[PDB]
Design a protein around this ligand. Structure first.
Ligand code: QHS
Ligand code: QHS
Lengths: 144, 145
């Protein structure tokens, strides 16, 4: 395709420059700032709640036969008493540990499926809360 | 609810976060994510190993709001004087990264998008034929770590 290398070269340039800027406390864009804040928040959460997070990840083990409903059931228990930014971070971290576990078990095919389940969950459940609570820009200000 | 603008940006956040978690354990979301990660790490390794020599390189270009592509190209051309290799491509990315950081430090934020476009032009004009001839970015990933 005519524009393939332009498009992938630009992607590589943007990624590398976003990374270099973030290392010095700068950001390529507002979306890059949201991504960075969420990456760091996930590390912080996983470190502070290591034992409690281990109890959560033990609740679900994805197989090629696992239905979205099983993921949605576990994630729903995480938000039964309500939503907050910390619980949203825990949701992202949970999805990340399910993907890690899938590749550990040589089921890399499940990674794209988990990503699609996470995006479905966010769309079906969490957008009204994100919007009412100032959006991802408020998360960046609260985290930083 | 319905599939609006927030669902698309939320999917982008999911992909970015999963890519980051997988990379922490030595895994990758995709081949493109693997290239991006290898280049990020190679840049860090280069900047650490050649800190003094790299400082001499970055000092060669005095960026200003009037700096043209030609001035970046002159300095970069010197870097590839003895030919192209993966290490000098890593040094080229690191150089562009340091110029962006310097621009923001000096409150000339406008130059960042100008540097990204210079890098893409230099990449397409001078380095891409060599990259295709030498196994592409996938070979760089296999060679690196
Ligand atoms: C990065 C980060 C994430 C989370 C916590 C912990 N935390 C928390 O501090 N809640 C605050 C209210 S808030 O969420 O708005 C605070 C912050 C969150 C980060 C962005 C800015 C706003 C509070 O109670 O005052 C929790 O809400 C929480 C605790 C445990 C779990 C859990 C642990 C294992 C398994 C299943 C759930 C989930 C969430 C700290 C730091
Ligand atoms: C991460 C990493 C990057 C680069 C070096 C250094 N290096 C190197 O080792 N080059 C070899 C081998 S290679 O490049 O084909 C492939 C290597 C390097 C890239 C990842 C895969 C493995 C060679 O001689 O060809 C160089 O080519 C080099 C040295 C100095 C400079 C410089 C330093 C300051 C200012 C201006 C120039 C630039 C490049 C080490 C580690």
């Amino acid at each position: 395709p005519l524009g393939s290398m332009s498009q992938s070269n630009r992607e590589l340039v943007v990624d590398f420059l976003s990374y270099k800027l973030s290392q010095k406390g700068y950001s390529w864009s507002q979306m890059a700032a949201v991504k960075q804040a969420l990456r760091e928040a996930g590390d912080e959460f996983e470190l502070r709640y290591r034992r409690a997070f281990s109890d959560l990840t033990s609740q679900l083990h994805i197989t090629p036969g696992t239905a979205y409903q099983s993921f949605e059931q576990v994630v729903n228990e995480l938000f039964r008493d309500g939503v907050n930014w910390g619980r949203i971070v825990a949701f992202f971290s949970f999805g990340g540990a399910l993907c890690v576990e899938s590749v550990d078990k040589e089921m890399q095919v499940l990674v794209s499926r988990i990503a699609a389940w996470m995006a479905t969950y966010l769309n079906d459940h969490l957008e009204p809360w994100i919007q009412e609570n100032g959006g991802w820009d408020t998360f960046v200000e609260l985290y930083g």
